[PDB]
Amino acid sequence: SMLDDAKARLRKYDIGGKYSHLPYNKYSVLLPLVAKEGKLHLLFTVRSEKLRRAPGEVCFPGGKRDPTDMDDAATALREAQEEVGLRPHQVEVVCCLVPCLIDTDTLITPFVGLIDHNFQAQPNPAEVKDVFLVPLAYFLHPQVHDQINHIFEYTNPEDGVTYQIKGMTANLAVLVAFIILEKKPT
């Protein structure tokens, strides 16, 4: 099946907890996969314009580890629950992808999660301005704009709204698209 095939592909790239104890400032992100209309999608958030860091930017759910978290996956799930109302029974964490080093002292660990079909996001408006889906296949043939660094523009066909996806968020989306969609019979 589509979902069993996606999980089997993802597991081959799992690094597990290999980098998880290193003494960094630690953040986790959840890369949330949603199956709709017979295709996989990624779920994105738009950060509230009120936030001090990166207001209005497209990002994955997640945030800073706190002492309550049993592990880095727990960080991602706790923060996703706060931000978009995703409950832990609604997400299956499949793997841990390559961590992202930034600022010399920070390590961001991405987890891919399969999201229940009955989940409906409840954006916390103090943190999240918007939530939207992009088909995973978009990231194989994105609409690229050069600002010199590459920005993706995705237009939702439901309403005509265009979102800019860039940086680490764009890079991780492409990675997941490659892992899941490369080398597949039609």
Ligand X SMILES: *CC(=O)N1CCC[C@H]1c1cccc(CC(=O)Nc2cccc(Cl)c2)c1
Give the three-class secondary structure for 176: helix
Closer by beta carbon to ligand X, 45 or else 90: 45
| Residue 166 Cβ vs ligand X, minimum distance, rounded to whole Å | 8
Residues between 76 and 135 with contacts to ligand X, criterion CB under 6 A: 83, 108, 127-128
Alpha-carbon dihedral of residues 71, 167, 123, 66, nearest 10 degrees? 20
For 55, residues 6+ apart whose C-beta sits below 8 A from its C-beta are 47, 48, 49
Site string for ligand X, 19-58 (x = CB under 6 A): --------x-x---------------x-x-----xx--x-
How big is the CA angle at 83 (ends 133 and 134), to the nearest 5 degrees? 10
Closer by beta carbon to ligand X, 56 or else 88: 56
Instruction: Consult the annotation and say whether 79 binds a ligand.
Output: yes
Closer by beta carbon to ligand X, 92 or else 127: 127
The residue whose Cβ lies closest to ligand X is: 59
| Residue 50 Cβ vs ligand X, minimum distance, rounded to whole Å | 10
Closer by beta carbon to ligand X, 60 or else 138: 60
Closest CA to 176 of 122, 95, 100: 95
Find the binder of ligand X among 32, 62, 113, 142 (CB under 6 A): 62
Find the binder of ligand X among 32, 61, 110, 142 (CB under 6 A): 61
Q: What gap in Å lies between CA 145 and CA 143, rounded to an integer?
A: 7
Q: What gap in Å lies between CA 44 and CA 173, rounded to an integer?
A: 10
The CA-based diameter of the chain, rounded to the nearest angstrom, is 46
Instruction: Quickly list DSSP for 104-120.
Output: TTEEEEEEEEEEPTT--
CB 145 within 8 A of CB 51: no
Please tell me whether residue 169 binds ligand X under the rule CB under 6 A: yes
Residues that bind ligand X (CB under 6 A): 27, 29, 45, 47, 53-54, 57, 59-63, 83, 108, 127-128, 168-169
Which residues define the annotated binding site? 79, 83
Which residues define the annotated binding site for Mg(2+)? 79, 83
